[PDB]
Design a protein around this ligand. Structure first.
Ligand SMILES: OC[C@H]1O[C@H](O[C@H]2[C@H](O)[C@@H](O)[C@@H](O[C@H]3[C@H](O)[C@@H](O)[C@@H](O[C@H]4[C@H](O)[C@@H](O)[C@@H](O)O[C@@H]4CO)O[C@@H]3CO)O[C@@H]2CO)[C@H](O)[C@@H](O)[C@@H]1O
Ligand SMILES: *O[C@H]1[C@H](O)[C@@H](O)[C@@H](O)O[C@@H]1CO
Ligand SMILES: [Cl-]
Ligand SMILES: [Cl-]
Ligand SMILES: [Cl-]
Length: 373
């Protein structure tokens, strides 16, 4: 019998439907007491929410796949059992398994596939307009944030550089300190004078007011944006961009959203936590998340269901997940330093705080900073 008491951390607006999922869980596991709350700072900050005091953190918590290597090496999460590993591998798409695997072992329970797309108001821009960055921004305003490296670091990947090597597993493998990296820096800088590019900390509000015709965003906002745009809703994969005078696809990161089990839980509570993590990432639960938020399941069967298959956001995400259109986020322990250092690199190029005469130096220093043992 599974019994115990578990705390579950989810992101703010997810609480209502995780309570529904937990009610489903409790039909099968009536002797597990679950408390569902928001986390202190959300799934994009699980590393530091848990690391501040692992023994006081939730037993099961939402976390993006890039954070897993750091958390595994710190001992905050343990490997999944053989049976749990088999279920993850068999039920979900291959990239979901890759996303949670570190040194040959799975460390979390994947549930959603995340790639950003263009969301746009089709009364302001056409499907043809959004195929290229320069064409889109010549015709309407794209609102975005150059201080968030999750948005723009993948331009370096479009430029032909590697992040932690060919596999994302090589500490010294980032090669952005190159002429190709400089092409990306120049692209950022070009956007400052692009009248169709608006820097904002809240792109969603600009879409809502009609001051932006398009934004780059992820599927955690799919249902939100469908509500904002109504009959004018449209979505597309990322456009091409011009780097060194050549059109190339602009990449996004591919992320896998997961739940992980805190290694501090023990005894019955540990078993209950693992059971909960497995249940809330099962097919039925993934489809409940989809119904409420529009996030894209990783379950193989759920992706093929008619509601998911007919959703234009799902189609655009599965295009973005193809080779060449995105790169799976690495999960190296160095990733937290990478994110911290990448944002000023990119934003400095955009604002001109880093002039072109400094691109090579700044890229060299960046690679040194993010490549330490
Ligand atoms: O140094 C800057 C920050 O670096 C680190 O943040 C990283 C994360 O570790 C990455 O996972 C990623 O974050 C993505 C995230 O993967 C993605 O899911 C999405 O997050 C949504 C979330 O799904 C949704 O439920 C709700 O919470 O809104 C979120 C968006 O606001 O988008 C994230 C990016 O915006 O990239 C960031 C870097 O931006 C580190 O964790 C931080 O502590 C640090 O500040
Ligand atoms: O996904 C975001 C939510 O929108 C915030 O409310 C909070 O939960 O942080 C996460 C990201 O970590
Ligand atoms: Cl697959
Ligand atoms: Cl361009
Ligand atoms: Cl415990």
């Amino acid at each position: 019998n599974v019994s115990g008491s578990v705390k579950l951390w989810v992101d703010t607006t997810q609480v209502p439907y995780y309570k529904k999922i937990v009610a489903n869980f409790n039909k099968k596991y009536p002797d597990v007491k679950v408390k569902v709350t928001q986390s202190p700072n959300g799934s994009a900050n699980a590393k530091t929410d848990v690391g501040k005091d692992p023994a006081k953190a939730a037993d099961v918590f939402e976390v993006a796949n890039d954070q897993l290597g750091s958390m595994a090496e710190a001992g905050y999460i343990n490997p999944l059992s053989p049976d749990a590993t088999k279920a993850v591998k068999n039920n979900n798409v291959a990239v979901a398994s890759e996303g949670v695997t570190w040194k040959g072992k799975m460390f979390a329970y994947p549930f959603a596939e995340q790639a950003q797309t263009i969301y746009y108001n089709k009364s302001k821009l056409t499907a043809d307009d959004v195929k290229t960055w320069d064409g889109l921004t010549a015709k309407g305003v794209l609102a975005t944030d150059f201080t968030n490296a999750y948005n723009f670091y993948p331009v370096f990947l479009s430029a032909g550089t590697q992040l932690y090597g060919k596999t994302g597993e090589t500490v010294k493998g980032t090669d952005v300190n190159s002429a190709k990296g400089e092409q990306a820096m120049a692209w950022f800088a070009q956007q400052k004078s692009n009248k169709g590019v608006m820097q904002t900390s809240n792109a969603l509000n600009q879409l809502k007011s009609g001051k932006a015709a398009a934004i780059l965003d992820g599927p955690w906002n799919s249902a939100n944006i469908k509500k904002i745009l109504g009959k004018n809703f449209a979505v597309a994969p990322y456009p091409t961009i011009k780097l060194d005078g050549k059109d190339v696809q602009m990449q996004a990161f591919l992320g896998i959203e997961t739940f992980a089990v805190n290694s501090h839980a023990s005894g019955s509570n540990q078993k209950a936590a693992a059971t909960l993590a497995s249940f809330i990432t099962n097919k039925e639960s993934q489809l409940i998340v989809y119904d409420h938020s529009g996030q894209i399941p990783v379950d193989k069967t759920a992706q093929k269901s008619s509601k998911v298959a007919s959703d234009p956001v799902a189609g655009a995400v599965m295009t973005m997940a193809k080779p060449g259109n995105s790169t799976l986020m690495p999960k190296m322990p160095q990733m937290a330093t990478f994110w911290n250092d990448a944002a000023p690199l990119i934003n400095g190029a955009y604002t001109g705080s880093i002039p072109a005469s400094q691109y090579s130096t700044k890229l060299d220093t960046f690679v040194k900073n993010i490549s330490k043992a």
